[PDB]
């Protein structure tokens, strides 16, 4: 198969912002491993000229989520948010980076 082009591993928050601020399309994102919280994943995404950061949460049942809908994998969370906004105030749909 093909590996996922959105997983960037352990990269700083500032480095994700520098990279995403240079993307052209709204929704360009990456998943990175948080340095502030070891073991947590951070979803960094571009909207307008800004770069917003979302913490990938895990509930008591071990399911991943951003708000209320629960997923069995990061892969499913990411794919679901290609057509459902990651934000409750803005319409930010995840779309792959131009590598």
């Amino acid at each position: 198969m093909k590996p996922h082009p959105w997983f960037f591993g352990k990269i700083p928050r500032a480095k994700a912002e520098e990279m995403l601020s240079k993307q052209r399309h709204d929704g360009a994102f990456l998943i990175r491993e948080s340095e502030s919280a070891p073991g947590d994943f951070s979803l960094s995404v571009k909207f307008g000229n800004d770069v917003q950061h979302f913490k990938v949460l895990r509930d008591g049942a071990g399911k991943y989520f951003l708000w209320v809908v629960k997923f069995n994998s990061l892969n499913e969370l990411v794919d679901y948010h290609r057509s459902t906004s990651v934000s409750r105030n803005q319409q930010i749909f995840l779309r792959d980076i131009e590598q």
Partner: peptide, 6 residues
């Protein structure tokens, strides 16, 4: 920070 916390 994080838009979704809390």
């Amino acid at each position: 920070x994080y838009v979704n916390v809390x």
